[PDB]
Structure 1
Amino acid sequence: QDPLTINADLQRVAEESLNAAVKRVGGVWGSAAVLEIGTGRLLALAPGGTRSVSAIYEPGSVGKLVTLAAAIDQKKVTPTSTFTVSSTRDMPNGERISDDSPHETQDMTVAGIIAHSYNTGTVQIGDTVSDSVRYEYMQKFGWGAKTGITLPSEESGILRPHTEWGDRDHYTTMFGQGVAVTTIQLAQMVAVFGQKGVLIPPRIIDGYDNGVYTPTVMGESRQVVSEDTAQTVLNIMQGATQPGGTAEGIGAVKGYNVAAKTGTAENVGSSGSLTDTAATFTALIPAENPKIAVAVVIYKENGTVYGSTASAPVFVDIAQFAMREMKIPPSTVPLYKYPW
């Protein structure tokens, strides 16, 4: 009978987790999308209606995965390249970049920089490639374009052409500021790293109706980064739940290796200035062999919510249930760790 991809139990878990989290942190709304790795199949989409495809926001640090993937794919850095991180860094073009949390100046590998989500390390990674090349990766990752899912009212998001970027834009676009995305776009993006560098268009329709039940096909996929890059990003993402990672404890799924990135993104409020926050979380599980990709956002007006405390618990509840329901055996290999 059923022509849609939505898993009804998973959908209930999603909605329940999402509602509870929005209320828990005093948010105004939230969204979550779960994609099946390798197929484009949408297993859950919360809330009901079109929010997950029509609400745009600056995603913050989850956007660092695009910057990182570009620099790795262009063979400009490795996971063990070292950069100095610090509270602030004055850049060649005169911009000051801050980490938004004071901390000791120290040297750290690319892997540690991403696990810790340090902006001062991230902008130096981004500076190893040209803006036109970065911008091209952004497009390939699906930003600035509708995903094509058969739901109404989908937004393309906002990706200004790189030729238009000023000194500040050059940097803010490396960590998900000055760009706007949908939740569905964030899920499509992260799945790439569990799909050998391939992006697969998301679908909600499994197949319609002689009047025969003919299933829908996978849709035109595209190589975004190489298989090696995808695997390296997937390894780096496993740093999130390790000691020192931004998702330590709170993003852990008992028995399963998690690959994730958090975000705490400033957003323009009702009265013009940067008063709002989107807490973002993008993850793949099990990390050694991803079966689902998840993106969660919780949006708050006139306050700060953190990717980790607002949105990670939504992913955890979703992910615990999905693994059991999909009969995925617990991880038998260690969580990946690069030296930091």
Structure 2
Amino acid sequence: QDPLTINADLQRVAEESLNAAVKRVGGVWGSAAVLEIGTGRLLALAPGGTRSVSAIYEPGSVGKLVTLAAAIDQKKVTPTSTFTVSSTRDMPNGERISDDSPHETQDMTVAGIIAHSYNTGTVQIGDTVSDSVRYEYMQKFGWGAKTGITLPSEESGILRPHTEWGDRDHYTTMFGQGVAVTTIQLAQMVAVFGQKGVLIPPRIIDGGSRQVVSEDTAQTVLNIMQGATQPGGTAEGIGAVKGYNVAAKTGTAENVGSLTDTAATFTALIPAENPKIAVAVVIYKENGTVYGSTASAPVFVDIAQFAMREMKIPPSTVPLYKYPW
């Protein structure tokens, strides 16, 4: 019978979690997409109108995975390459870049950088690759284009041609600012890292795809992503799905509305040793800041715990991956 892909129980979990989280956090709206890994099948899409597919927003530091992957794919960097992290850092082109909150400067590996999500580290990582190269990766990950799901009013996102980026744009697009995204785009993206560098176009209809990154870089981005829940990681505690290895990335971005809003974002893969779902969450607050971790992780967590039961996936048999930092 059922020609749609939605899992009704999973959908209800999503809507519930989502609704609660938006209330909890004083947001004005939210959205969540759960994609099955390997098939591109939508298991859940909240809030169930079309806003999930048509509301666009600057995603923030979830965009960091695009730049990380580019640098790695181009072999310009490795998990264990080391850079200096600082509360601010003045760049060649006259730009000052700042971390969320000041910290003692120190050297960190790439692994630890995006794990702590330090802009000052990632900006350096992005500088190892040309803007036209980054730009091309951004497009292959599906930014600035409709995913092509069969639901009305999909927005294409905003991805200005790199040849158009100023000194600020050079660096802001490195951590998902100066770019607009829909939640469906974000799920499709992270899905790549569980798909051996392949992007599968999402589907809501079953029935009386492209290579974005190498299989190897996908897997390394996958290992780095597991650093999110470990001590010091932005999703420590809050991102934990008891008994299951979680690869994830938070994001907390400013948006206009001028520049008074924020979008708390979360994109995760689970279970990390062998991903079965790709999850993307966003909660938008209007005159206030809201953190991907405090806001959106809990949603993923509720969804993720159910999905693992629902899909009769056994708990993780192997340790959460660690690179030294």
TM-score by length of 2: 0.99
Inter-partner Cα distance in structure 2 for 1:206 and 1:17: 26
Larger Rg: 1
Identical-residue share of aligned pairs (%): 100
Q: Equivalent residue of 1:4, what SS?
A: coil
Q: Equivalent residue of 1:180, what SS?
A: coil
Inter-partner Cα distance in structure 2 for 1:41 and 1:273: 37
Inter-partner Cα distance in structure 2 for 1:168 and 1:305: 23
Tell me, which stretches of 5 or more residues in structure 2 are unaligned? none
Inter-partner Cα distance in structure 2 for 1:100 and 1:312: 18
Cα deviation 1:150-179 (Å, max 9, x = unaligned): 000000010000000110000000000100
Q: Give the Å deviation of 1:273.
A: 1.8
Cα deviation 1:210-257 (Å, max 9, x = unaligned): xxxxxxxxxxx0000000000000000000000000000000000000
Residues matched between the structures, number = 324
Q: Equivalent residue of 2:45, what SS?
A: strand
Cα deviation 1:307-331 (Å, max 9, x = unaligned): 0010000000000000001000000
Q: Equivalent residue of 2:175, what SS?
A: coil
Inter-partner Cα distance in structure 2 for 1:238 and 1:273: 35
Inter-partner Cα distance in structure 2 for 1:110 and 1:184: 27
Cα deviation 1:11-34 (Å, max 9, x = unaligned): 000000000000000000000000
Q: Equivalent residue of 1:289, what SS?
A: coil
Q: Give the Å deviation of 1:279.
A: 0.3
Counterpart in the other structure of 2:185 = 185
Cα deviation 1:71-102 (Å, max 9, x = unaligned): 00000000000000000000000000001211
Inter-partner Cα distance in structure 1 for 2:190 and 2:100: 25
Cα deviation 1:17-53 (Å, max 9, x = unaligned): 0000000000000000000000000000000111110
Question: Paired residue for 2:302, among 317, 321, 326?
Answer: 317
Q: Equivalent residue of 1:19, what SS?
A: helix
Counterpart in the other structure of 1:119 = 119
Q: Equivalent residue of 1:24, what SS?
A: helix
Q: Give the Å deviation of 1:142.
A: 0.2
Inter-partner Cα distance in structure 1 for 2:84 and 2:115: 15
Inter-partner Cα distance in structure 2 for 1:204 and 1:49: 14
Moved over 4 A (4+): none
Tell me, which stretches of 5 or more residues in structure 1 are unaligned? 208-220
Inter-partner Cα distance in structure 1 for 2:258 and 2:29: 19
Q: Give the Å deviation of 1:337.
A: 0.2
Cα deviation 1:89-137 (Å, max 9, x = unaligned): 0000000000121100100000000000000000000000000000000
Counterpart in the other structure of 1:286 = 271
Q: Give the Å deviation of 1:286.
A: 0.2
Question: Paired residue for 1:237, among 216, 219, 225?
Answer: 225
Cα deviation 1:172-214 (Å, max 9, x = unaligned): 000001000000000000000000000000000011xxxxxxx
Q: Give the Å deviation of 1:300.
A: 0.1
